[PDB]
Amino acid sequence: ADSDINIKTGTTDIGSNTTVKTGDLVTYDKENGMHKKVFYSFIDDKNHNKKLLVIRTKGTIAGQYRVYSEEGANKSGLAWPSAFKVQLQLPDNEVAQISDYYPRNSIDTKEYMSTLTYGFNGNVTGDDTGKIGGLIGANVSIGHTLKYVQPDFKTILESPTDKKVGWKVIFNNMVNQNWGPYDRDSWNPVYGNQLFMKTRNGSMKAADNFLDPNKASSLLSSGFSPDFATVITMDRKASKQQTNIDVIYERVRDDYQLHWTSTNWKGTNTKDKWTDRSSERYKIDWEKEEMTN
Amino acid sequence: ADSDINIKTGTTDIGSNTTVKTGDLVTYDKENGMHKKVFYSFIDDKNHNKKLLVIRTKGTIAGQYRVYSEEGANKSGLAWPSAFKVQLQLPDNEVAQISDYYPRNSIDTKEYMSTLTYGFNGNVTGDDTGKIGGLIGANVSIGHTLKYVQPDFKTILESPTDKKVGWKVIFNNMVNQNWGPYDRDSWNPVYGNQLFMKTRNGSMKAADNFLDPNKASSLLSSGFSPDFATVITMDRKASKQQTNIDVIYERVRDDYQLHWTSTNWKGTNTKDKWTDRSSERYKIDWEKEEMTN
Amino acid sequence: ADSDINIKTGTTDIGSNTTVKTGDLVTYDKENGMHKKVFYSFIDDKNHNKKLLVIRTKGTIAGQYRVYSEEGANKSGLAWPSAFKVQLQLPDNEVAQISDYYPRNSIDTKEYMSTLTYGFNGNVTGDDTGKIGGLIGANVSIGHTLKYVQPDFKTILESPTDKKVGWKVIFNNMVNQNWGPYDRDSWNPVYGNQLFMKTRNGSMKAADNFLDPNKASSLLSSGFSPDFATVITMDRKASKQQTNIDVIYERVRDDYQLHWTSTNWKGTNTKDKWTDRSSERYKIDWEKEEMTN
Amino acid sequence: ADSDINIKTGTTDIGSNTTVKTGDLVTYDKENGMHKKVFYSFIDDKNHNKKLLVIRTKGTIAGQYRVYSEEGANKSGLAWPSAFKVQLQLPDNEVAQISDYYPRNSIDTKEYMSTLTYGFNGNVTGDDTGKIGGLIGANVSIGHTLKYVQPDFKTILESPTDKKVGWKVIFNNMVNQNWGPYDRDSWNPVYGNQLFMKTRNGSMKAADNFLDPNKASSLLSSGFSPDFATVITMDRKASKQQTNIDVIYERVRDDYQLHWTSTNWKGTNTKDKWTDRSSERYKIDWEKEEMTN
Amino acid sequence: ADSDINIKTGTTDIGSNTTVKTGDLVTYDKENGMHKKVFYSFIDDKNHNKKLLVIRTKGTIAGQYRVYSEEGANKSGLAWPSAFKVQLQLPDNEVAQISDYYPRNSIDTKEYMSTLTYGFNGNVTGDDTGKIGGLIGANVSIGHTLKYVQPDFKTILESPTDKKVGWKVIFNNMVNQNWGPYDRDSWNPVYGNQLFMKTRNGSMKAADNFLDPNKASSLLSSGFSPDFATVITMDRKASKQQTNIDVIYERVRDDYQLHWTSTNWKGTNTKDKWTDRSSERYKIDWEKEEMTN
Amino acid sequence: ADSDINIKTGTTDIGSNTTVKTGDLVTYDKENGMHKKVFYSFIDDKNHNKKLLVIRTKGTIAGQYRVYSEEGANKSGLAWPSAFKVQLQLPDNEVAQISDYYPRNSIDTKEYMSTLTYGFNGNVTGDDTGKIGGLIGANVSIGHTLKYVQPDFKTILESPTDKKVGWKVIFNNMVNQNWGPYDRDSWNPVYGNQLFMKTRNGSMKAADNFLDPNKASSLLSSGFSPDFATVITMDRKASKQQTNIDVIYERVRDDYQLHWTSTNWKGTNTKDKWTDRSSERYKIDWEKEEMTN
């Protein structure tokens, strides 16, 4: 921080004595079940070498955990979101550039623990027949414990360039009714993948043996709300002070199938089966300081 | 955050140098046992591209955990709230838009722990008949541990559109007299669903074998108090500057019955049996910055 | 919060540029032993659609944990507070309404954790008689643990309407000399209810076998100090700008009885045996902005 | 802190009453997959003995975890980033100097605990044939437990001079499907280095037996975002008030190979196989207070 | 703190309404590998009975974990820093005094826990030959646990006088590949001191058997960054208003040697084998409020 | 705090609208090796009934842990500091009074936990001879664990009067090379008091058998830095507005002795062997608002 380098907190930050122009752009894609809101801020700090535009991509992409297919009482399929993505793209001819973005990738951590135990014991026996016994034991042990946290979804900043940045919130793993956790590659030779299986044996049909969405992660059904920030810089001396930018919301869905093997239920998951892409273009006016679509 | 992208804190926030007009709208629905309070705020920031209204839905939806039925003394019923809902929606002809909302859906986590243990042990035996023995063992162990938090109720942001937004606080699970936790699906081959039974074999009238609401979640009896926020945006040049909005407060009750099977008590639970809905329309005047009902 | 929906912090709060009139109204009810203190605040924010009065009920209701009955060294009774309550109530004809209140009910949480461990071991044996033995073991064990916090008393907001609000802080459970906990329903075949029992087989007067109040929850003896907030609203156009409001402080006392079964002690707790109520009426002058009793 | 030595907080900090000139310089190296962004701030505090330039190197270095060699289904290679580096350097002919930098090296800690237990036991035995027996044992044990945190990558400030400074984020160790963690020096006589192996003996093309990047540290694939600060001082009376500074962003890649040994997979890791390096020259103007490239 | 004694926070601090004069003095000692930076602040508070100078000694003392010697393939030595020191010294004929300094020595702490547990157990036995067994055991257990943190290095304020102050960051102990930790006095009869030994009986030469510095504390290689503050006071009517102060940066290196005994490796550590001292004199001018070297 | 009693924070604090006169008086007692610094603050708040003097006693009392006597090579003594002290004394004829002081004594706590666990198990046996066995065991276990934190030294406010106040920082207990902790009273019949015993039975001079101070509490060698506050009040109309005050710094030193019993070392410690007193008188002028020595 600024204090770590003996500087007055806030001395190097942008934005002081600047009239900031902000705005809201809301769109709803019915075909793709996506509420998309862009919140923009134009900062023209005369003491800074470039103009800035901070774009915040928010709103919410519905989960859409659905039993889309049912081939009889013995086979049924479920579509579930395995990934949520938001991307911003400036055409390559553009002179404006992506400068900063938030959040970024974090270094994970784990907790390590080692234990060395060693004891001794002595036992003295005997009985009514005047017998007498003994026992002198010894022992050593070495335990290793590893501890770490596992979010249900991971938020990853995808490698940016000066014209493109994007985030993806991917399915990590989940606890199905206290067991598991199970993930996209979970496999049991008997039950197959058990991610969204309600019961392992059941006289019910297939469409009725999928996990209750109220019992799974809330992003799977209700949805995920993005809240990412991208900073775009523009040179004051540039000849074109109008910039096009495409923002793309996206949902990647997997295909989880259940089926009766006559004795038990078997589940299978096909990765990245479908992709719902909601794309849109906005125009940035650096002179009037307003974004439109 | 704004500091993460090297910008002076609060620079991109809306509302500075704006006269804000607020108001309280209170209504009590005696039939539905719902105290409804709407707290609004009109913010016309001239540096923002839109007029804004922040609506905070608060108040209290009574729980109403009650023994409604009494079938002699072998059977009885208990009506309890499995869900609390608050939804806001603009008629599809309206020009105003749902822009933001809070709270949103959270990504859950779990703590993982892998343990690998291995040890050795020697034993030296003997007795008065000069006997001698020995023992040399070796062992291995591989433990796993999953640890997570389980709230009594979950607060979920339902998939929003530019015209509709809602929240659902649903029952998750609950500890009954230091045992469980039980949920709406708990089944005991012999006892059935034990969610609200006081005693398994206790000899009483059915209507007295239900848990004391004082021992269950306080939301079941006294109720839940909403505190949700919606942000609606409006174009300064839209033709009609009046807007209608419907707000609904709901309570979904379940039917938990207790019956004697000569030997013990058998609990049963039937989902979403009854729905209490309290709907109301408010008028938004963007010109006078007022809200009424 | 405001910041979550991109608005300058505090933009939405009431009370800005308003001269607030405050006051204290203290009363001590000697019979019921309740020091009652009302702290009021009138806020007439002109940018708000209604006048506000924030009433804070404080002071302290004495516990009154007392051994009232003494029937010789055989039996004895103990009156202890099982509940403390504070209610506010507007006559039905008043046009002012209860708008908000604090604290409210919170969702409780618990910690769940499953464990799956499995090991293997081999043991070689032998002795002076040249004998040889062996052993190959294997094992598995599935554990589950549940962790949660338990307050000695619970503060519950009772279902509000627009004319009345109230709270009750009720006895939950409590530890007695390192063991238990014990609640109003704890029952043992030998001893009955050991809630306030000093010893199981001590040979004293029944009146000396009750727990030292210094070793029990201090709310039981010294008392509870309420600190609740109720905000009432009033129309600026209303005809009568005068409001009557009743405030009730009450203690619910239980009856704990100890008697000697010749070999040991026996505990018996009779619920809600007694009820102390202290009602007082205040007058609210919305024009002069003052409250009197 | 200033407070610990009885001085008003922030009294000794630089940056007050100075008009600070800031700026961003963005470059994207397509070939190296590195988004580089330099954010600078000139601080000319007249009450400080030198002019200051704070340089924050940010942006992001793509991870590039890649299956580079697919020499059949018996052998394959993976390229992963073992280190990410950012270095700044003033040509030895410069009069300006590196005064400070952030972050720095921290002192690691470790939890230590000792356990000393000892107990006794008695045992009475017998049977139907009137027999009796006994057993009196005792026992002692000493346990030792060491606990510490291990990040996936370590951030290290490399030994600075007044002309060069740099940071390197190196791969520490990592968990592979609940086990390990493994590192660049891991070895199992049977499997070799299992850092990135999906299955120990899975019948697939070698190029399909590598850990899924979504299951590995996100820095490996998506990349790392530097956020380092270095402050350069400059004397107002210096002859040349123009300074050159070279900035190096780099990625060192290791070579991980999976080869099938007719019964199982064997992993091999070759350190520092490749080095990607993007170097740039920036020109500092202490008089006009701007930086260009 | 001020508030603990009913005084307005900050009322007692120095430095208000003072124009503070600060400066940077950077020096790089090439032969000793020390980046030395002094950050000074003159504070002339007219309400304080003295003129103060706060000197902040920062920079970085390179670690220099180097194998300096090699006597063939079975003998080699590694130099490593066991202590890092910073000292300030005013010649005794001077009238300025060391008034305060920070950091200082902290009182350590340790967590202790006792445990008393006891149980009973009964076992019924029998077989097909109608036999009947029995067993009634008992047991007691006394346990003790000690928990505390062990930093790799310790920061100690050396006993100061009014003309001298100094700190020493000294090596405590370190974890070598999950085992240990080992300190400068660790002694194993077969392996000697295993502090930086890579393998116990590897096949390489001596210079190839030392621990990778990337797997050791980063202070050993990259070095330590000092951040210590000294406060010096001067009387305004002292005749001599010039002061010379010497500041010394120091590194104490130990000698760790490895030797192959043809059966295994054996380590050795000789303490304080070398001392790298870097001194410098600065002239403090209290009249001009300037510091130079 | 103020907010608990509905009063604006800081409303009842002293210091408002006052010009505070501060100062430093540094002394270095060479013989007792004590760096003494007195930081004063005169606060004449006109709305407060008395003038105020806040004396802060800082500086450092050297530890001086050293081998004072080598009585051969099997007899040696060690002088270590058992207590550090700071006292302030107003002569009895003074009218000024000691009003407040900081820090004060705090109530300690400890964690307690009662465990109750029982189980049941059955085992079926057999063999090749067709023989069958059985086993049905049951158990119970009551555990009790106590846990608390214990500092190496306790800082204690000695009982003050209106004319004197003091603090004593006394040695509590300490971990010696991972075992212990030992205190001034530790007694083992085989080795006596093992507090500073390096080895239990090594072959060196006794003086080479004391714990490395680098491995013991830093307070013992480098010293303790006091930071105690004393608030002195004075009537504005007191006859003489001058005041004398004595300030004493102390170090009590114990005697730790080691003697070889030709099998093992035996340690022994005699309490409060020496006392080092460093006293000083200061004059307080309430008219001029300055303090001298």
UniProtKB/Swiss-Prot annotation, chains A, B, C, D, E, F:
<keyword id="KW-0800">Toxin</keyword>
<dbReference type="GO" id="GO:0042802">
    <property type="term" value="F:identical protein binding"/>
</dbReference>
<comment type="function">
    <text>Alpha-toxin binds to the membrane of eukaryotic cells (particularly red blood cells, RBC) forming pores, resulting in hemolysis, with the release of low-molecular weight molecules leading to eventual osmotic RBC lysis. Human RBCs bind much less alpha-toxin than do rabbit RBCs. Heptamer oligomerization and pore formation is required for lytic activity.</text>
</comment>
<comment type="subunit">
    <text>Self-assembles to first form a non-lytic oligomeric intermediate, and then, a mushroom-shaped homoheptamer structure of 100 Angstroms in length and up to 100 Angstroms in diameter. Interacts with human ADAM10; this interaction is required for toxin pore formation, disruption of focal adhesions, and hly-mediated cytotoxicity.</text>
</comment>
<keyword id="KW-0204">Cytolysis</keyword>
<dbReference type="GO" id="GO:0051715">
    <property type="term" value="P:cytolysis in another organism"/>
</dbReference>
<keyword id="KW-0964">Secreted</keyword>
<keyword id="KW-0732">Signal</keyword>
<dbReference type="InterPro" id="IPR036435">
    <property type="entry name" value="Leukocidin/porin_MspA_sf"/>
</dbReference>
<dbReference type="InterPro" id="IPR003963">
    <property type="entry name" value="Bi-component_toxin_staph"/>
</dbReference>
<dbReference type="InterPro" id="IPR005831">
    <property type="entry name" value="Aerolysin/haemolysin_CS"/>
</dbReference>
<comment type="similarity">
    <text>Belongs to the aerolysin family.</text>
</comment>
<protein>
    <recommendedName>
        <fullName>Alpha-hemolysin</fullName>
    </recommendedName>
</protein>
<dbReference type="GO" id="GO:0005576">
    <property type="term" value="C:extracellular region"/>
</dbReference>
<dbReference type="Pfam" id="PF07968">
    <property type="entry name" value="Leukocidin"/>
</dbReference>
<dbReference type="GO" id="GO:0090729">
    <property type="term" value="F:toxin activity"/>
</dbReference>
<keyword id="KW-0354">Hemolysis</keyword>
<dbReference type="InterPro" id="IPR016183">
    <property type="entry name" value="Leukocidin/Hemolysin_toxin"/>
</dbReference>
<keyword id="KW-0843">Virulence</keyword>
